Each structure stands twice: as structure tokens, then as C-alpha cells.
């Protein structure tokens, strides 16, 4: 029973991962072949940069503005910066913008979304000059709409790139996210890779590799069939016509009679997919963004992401059939995620109830082997030995995301603190109780048993490997070898400031 269950789980997970790797490799080969035919100094299309931020650290905002200004693309109509400010404490963003760009900063007293006239000509009169807009605090949803309105002033603009206030762009980042748009007429959105730059925390160290693996496996597999459901907040590209078409549904959302605030990126990709358009993700575009270093903040972010995903999965399933043959892979991936979550929950419950040492050791060994294979693949792809630290991802995943998904499911249908971390605390207490029950029930020692010694040796080897990994990470932290090259430059610049 249990042997068959874990064997089937491991076989299916390995097969799906291998298929995703093959799909990502094929997509990368296709993108490389497309790029190989790109003429030198390609600037046929016109792009506009839209940046939105709120309560951003001054150094991060300045570095993002400098990185955007350092782009080597020779066809940029204008730079649009929309900040949900209109407050005394929000004037720092405008002051920083004036130090890096022109002083043409406007502070309209009305919001375009809430105004009877949605055209931006009432608040802006010049297109050639860069403009900064300060608006009352309404959310990221309203900030993007202002940029979209300001980017539709002239017909010359054919595409726009959305950049977060904490995103550091490469020299050719803009070109790599606009080139695939012209490759195929059906392509309307382009996804860019996002990489975590700070690795000074054990949580951030695992988050960086999780982001790398996600972007280079799942996004590539989705883009092979052109069914990407998330273009990426820090780095993403869109076409002007599809935005003009889907602006109204994206602002007039109605789920259960209340306007939604989360799901800023997933909903836009879902709206793009509902029109039958194709989205292609490219890995040659590199974007750097920060990651939270607090367990509670990471749990809250994961809960919000799970809420957005479970809200948008119904729309994804309902719109997948509009692509004909395409979308079958997307539906299969959604079903895979749902069945994987249910199977993980069922397996955990079965292990907790039975508390059999033989099943526990086998499951731990299978999970460790799968994670080791994934880490080896990541190291081979990234050509870096730091990918082997992904073996510690299982602990943080189990202790953070599962309660986050539980909370997301429960919230669909003192008090504020209970709504956030009480479920996580209950999950931790239940896990501890299950572990105590398992240890107490099997409180015996029999060195004459083949199976008992096998389980003991397996658990001892697992503990030794975990201890070795933690010791290696601690040694690397002191030596600061795990620090990314970009992080060191930022630290030096902050010191010399």
C-alpha cells in the first residue's frame, strides 16, 4: 500500500519534471534559433517604460532608475513613472526621480480610473518629455492604468514594458523582451526572468534558487506551448493593442460583488489568454529583485499568492479551451498541481496516523533523492555549485507554504493576527504532536532486525547529510562566498554613500 503509493508519487513527479525539463530545453533552443536571425541594431519597434512604486527605499529606487537609464535599446519613446503618492512623505520619490531624470513632475488631484474622462490628456499635454505622476493612494491597479493611458497618446508606441521600482535591468533587458513580440503576430506578451540578488539569509538563499528553477523550468515549459499564465512582475512586456482592449475588464473586475486588490499580474495574463493570444517567455532577459528575509512576511506573501492562484485557476480552466489544441498542457499542469497538493496532504495524514518507521524512512529517502536530482539539474543548467543548497528547500516549503495554502483555502468563504498565523501555529503544533507520537510509539531498539537497522541507518544518514549541508552553508556565510556579485557592488555603493 504505502510502498506503491510513494513509488507512484516519486515516479510521476520525476516523469513530470523530466518532461518539463525537455520542454524548457526545446523552448530555449527555439528562442536561440530565433535570436540567431536577428539583425544587428534592431530597433524597428517602439517601446515605453512604465515604473510603479510605493514606499520604496531611496537607494533601490535610484538604482532601478539608473539601470533603466543604462538600457542599450535605441528606440524608447518616453519613460513613464506613476507613484500612488499625493502626500508629504511621498515627495521623496519625486525628488529622487528629479535627480535622475527631468523635473517635469505632475501631481493631478484626480484619479483617471475614478474620473468620468479616462483619457490622460486632462493631466498630460506633452508626450516627448518624460512625465512623473503623483496620485492619491489607491493601489498598484490604478498606477498601471495611468501608465497605460499615458502610453497610448501617440500611435508610434507599439509595446510597453512594466518594471517594478525594485527591479535592476541589464543593458539589453529591454531588447530581449521586445524582440519576441515581432517574431510572431500571435505573440502579445513576453515574460522575463527574475533573479534574487541578495543571498545573505537562509530563506533568501533558497528563494533565489526556487525562483531560478521556476522561471527556467515551468515558465519555459508553458512558453513552449505559448500558454504562460504569469509574465512576471519585476520584468514583463505587453502589446499596446491588447492592453487597450483589456483595460476595462482589468479595472471592472467583479468576483463576488467586491473589487479585487490582489492578483495584479496573474489576472492580466488570464485576460490576455482569454483572447486566444500567445505568450512567450524568454530567459535571456535578466531582472534583479529583492526577496523578503522574514518568515512571517514570506508566509503572508505566499498566502496572498496562493489566494490569487486559486482564484484565477477557475478562469484559466474556463479559458484554456479557447486555444484549441493549445491549453491542454495548461489544464494538465493545473490538474497536476491540484492532485500533487491533495496527494501530499493525504500522504502526510497517512504517515501521521500509521507512524510506521519503515514508511517514514523510505519516504524521506525518496524525497531526498528527488531533491538531489533537481539540485543537480539546476547546477548543470546554471553552471554553479551553489544550486546544491536546494536540498534545504523541503523544510521551508513544508513549514511555510502548506499552512499558507490552508489559510488561502479557508479565507475564501488580536483578530487580525489570528487570521494570519494562527493556522500556521496550529499546523506546527500538529506536526510536532505527530512527531512525538511517532517517536513514542517506536521507542525500542532491536539490532537483530534487518528492517529496523535499515531504517536507523537511513535516518542517521539523512541527519548527517542535513548537518553537513548546514555546516557548509554556515562556512560559506562567514566567507561570504555565497554572496552574488551584484550584491557586493550594492553593499560597496551603500557604504560609499
Amino acid at each position: 500500500s504505502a510502498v506503491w503509493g510513494i513509488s507512484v508519487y516519486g515516479v510521476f513527479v520525476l516523469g513530470f519534471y523530466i518532461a518539463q525539463i525537455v520542454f524548457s530545453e526545446f523552448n530555449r533552443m527555439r528562442l536561440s534559433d530565433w535570436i540567431s536571425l536577428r539583425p544587428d541594431n534592431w530597433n524597428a519597434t517602439r517601446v515605453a517604460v512604465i515604473i510603479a512604486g510605493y514606499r520604496e527605499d531611496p537607494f533601490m529606487f535610484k538604482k532601478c532608475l539608473e539601470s533603466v537609464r543604462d538600457s542599450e535599446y535605441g528606440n524608447v519613446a518616453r519613460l513613464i513613472c506613476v507613484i500612488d503618492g499625493d502626500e508629504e512623505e511621498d515627495l521623496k520619490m519625486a525628488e529622487i526621480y528629479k535627480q535622475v531624470y527631468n523635473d517635469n513632475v505632475k501631481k493631478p488631484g484626480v484619479v483617471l480610473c475614478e474620473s468620468e474622462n479616462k483619457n490622460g490628456s486632462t493631466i498630460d499635454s506633452d508626450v516627448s518629455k518624460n512625465i512623473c505622476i503623483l496620485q492619491p493612494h489607491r493601489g498598484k491597479r490604478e498606477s498601471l492604468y495611468t501608465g497605460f493611458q499615458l502610453a497610448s497618446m501617440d500611435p508610434s508606441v507599439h509595446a510597453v514594458v512594466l518594471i517594478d521600482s525594485d527591479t535592476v535591468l541589464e543593458k539589453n533587458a529591454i531588447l530581449e523582451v521586445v524582440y519576441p513580440l515581432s517574431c510572431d503576430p500571435n505573440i502579445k506578451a513576453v515574460a522575463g526572468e527574475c533573479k534574487i540578488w541578495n543571498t545573505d539569509t537562509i530563506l533568501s538563499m533558497l528563494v533565489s534558487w526556487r525562483y531560478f528553477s521556476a522561471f527556467n523550468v515551468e515558465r519555459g515549459a508553458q512558453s513552449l506551448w505559448k500558454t504562460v499564465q504569469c509574465v512576471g512582475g519585476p520584468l514583463g512586456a505587453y502589446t499596446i493593442d491588447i492592453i487597450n482592449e483589456i483595460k476595462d475588464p482589468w479595472i471592472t473586475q467583479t468576483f463576488l460583488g467586491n473589487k479585487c486588490t490582489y492578483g495584479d499580474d496573474r489576472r492580466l495574463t488570464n485576460e490576455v489568454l482569454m483572447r486566444g493570444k500567445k505568450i512567450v517567455y524568454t530567459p535571456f532577459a535578466v531582472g534583479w529583485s529583492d526577496s523578503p528575509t522574514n518568515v512571517m512576511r514570506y508566509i503572508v506573501q505566499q498566502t496572498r499568492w496562493s489566494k490569487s492562484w486559486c482564484r484565477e485557476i477557475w478562469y484559466t480552466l474556463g479559458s484554456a479551451w479557447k486555444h484549441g489544441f493549445s491549453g491542454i498542457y495548461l489544464a494538465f499542469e493545473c490538474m497536476y498541481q491540484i492532485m500533487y497538493f491533495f496527494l501530499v496532504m493525504y500522504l502526510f495524514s497517512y504517515i501521521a496516523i500509521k507512524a510506521d518507521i519503515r514508511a517514514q524512512t523510505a519516504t524521506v529517502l525518496v524525497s531526498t533523492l528527488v531533491t538531489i536530482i533537481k539540485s543537480s539539474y539546476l547546477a548543470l543548467r546554471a553552471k554553479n555549485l551553489k544550486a546544491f543548497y536546494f536540498v534545504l528547500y523541503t523544510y521551508v516549503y513544508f513549514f511555510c507554504m502548506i499552512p499558507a495554502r490552508i489559510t488561502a483555502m479557508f479565507t475564501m468563504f488580536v483578530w487580525l493576527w489570528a487570521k494570519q498565523f494562527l493556522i500556521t501555529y496550529m499546523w506546527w503544533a500538529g506536526v510536532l504532536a505527530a512527531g512525538v507520537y511517532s517517536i513514542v510509539d517506536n521507542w525500542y531498539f532491536d539490532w537483530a532486525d534487518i528492517q529496523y537497522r535499515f531504517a536507523l541507518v537511513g535516518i542517521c544518514s539523512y541527519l548527517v547529510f542535513v548537518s553537513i549541508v548546514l555546516v557548509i552553508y554556515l562556512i560559506g556565510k562567514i566567507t561570504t562566498w555565497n554572496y552574488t556579485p551584484l550584491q557586493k557592488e550594492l553593499i560597496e555603493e551603500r557604504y560609499l554613500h
Epitope: 525500542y444 531498539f445 532486525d449 528492517q451
Partner: nanobody, 124 residues
């Protein structure tokens, strides 16, 4: 501490089937390892069979297939089944229990707990 009591055992012809059951009462029978020993009238006691907590079955020499052992955790009892019995196998049988032990399991000193024992007699 577990108390071992045994039931069954009587006269039977050669080649018949006989079953002996040893009942153990304690805090947790599932975590204890049971074993069976026989003491010949003119020979010292020797190992016969034993079952571990993980349902691992061990058999002595010349009794690999003749003797079958099993345990049931619902009634917290262990029983031994004898098939194709020979008259040379008659002796008094004791059941033993053990929780902590080393690699040695065929010696009397390893098993701290012991039972009263039942004597079986067979005639050709």
C-alpha cells in the same frame, strides 16, 4: 514488564498439526519481540523461532518450513503453528519477550522475560 501465559499442547499422532499460543499482557505488545524455545528432557534448550516488532520472521535449522509463526496485535497474542511434526521434536516449549537487545538473539540471556511453558508429547 510483560506477563507471558501459554495455552494449548496435547497428545497427537505423528504428522499431525498442533498450535501453541502465548499471550503477553503489557503496556504495548506491538513494540516487543517474541521468541520460542524448547527444552528437551535430556538436552539443553535451543532456539526455535522468533518474530520481531516489524513482522520479521526467523527460523532455526530444520524448521524452516515445518514451523510457521505469526502474531496478532488485536488480541495481543502470538501463536506458533507446527506441521509435519516428527516424534524427535517433543519437548517443553517456552515463549520469551524482549524489547532492547543487540545483534545476538539465539541466546537465553538476550530474552529477559520467560513463561511457564507447556509440555507436548507425541507418539509414533
Amino acid at each position: 514488564q510483560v506477563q507471558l501465559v501459554e495455552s494449548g499442547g496435547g497428545l497427537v499422532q505423528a504428522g499431525g498439526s498442533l498450535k501453541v499460543s502465548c499471550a503477553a499482557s503489557g503496556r504495548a505488545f506491538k513494540t516487543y519481540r517474541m521468541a520460542w524455545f524448547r527444552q528437551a528432557p535430556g538436552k539443553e534448550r535451543e532456539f526455535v523461532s522468533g518474530i520481531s516488532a516489524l513482522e520479521t520472521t526467523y527460523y532455526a535449522d530444520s524448521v524452516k518450513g515445518r514451523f510457521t509463526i505469526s502474531r496478532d496485535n488485536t488480541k495481543n497474542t502470538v501463536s506458533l503453528q507446527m506441521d509435519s511434526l516428527k516424534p524427535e521434536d517433543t519437548a517443553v516449549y517456552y515463549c520469551a519477550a524482549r524489547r532492547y537487545g543487540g545483534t545476538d538473539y539465539t541466546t537465553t540471556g538476550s530474552y529477559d522475560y520467560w513463561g511457564q511453558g507447556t509440555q507436548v508429547t507425541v507418539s509414533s
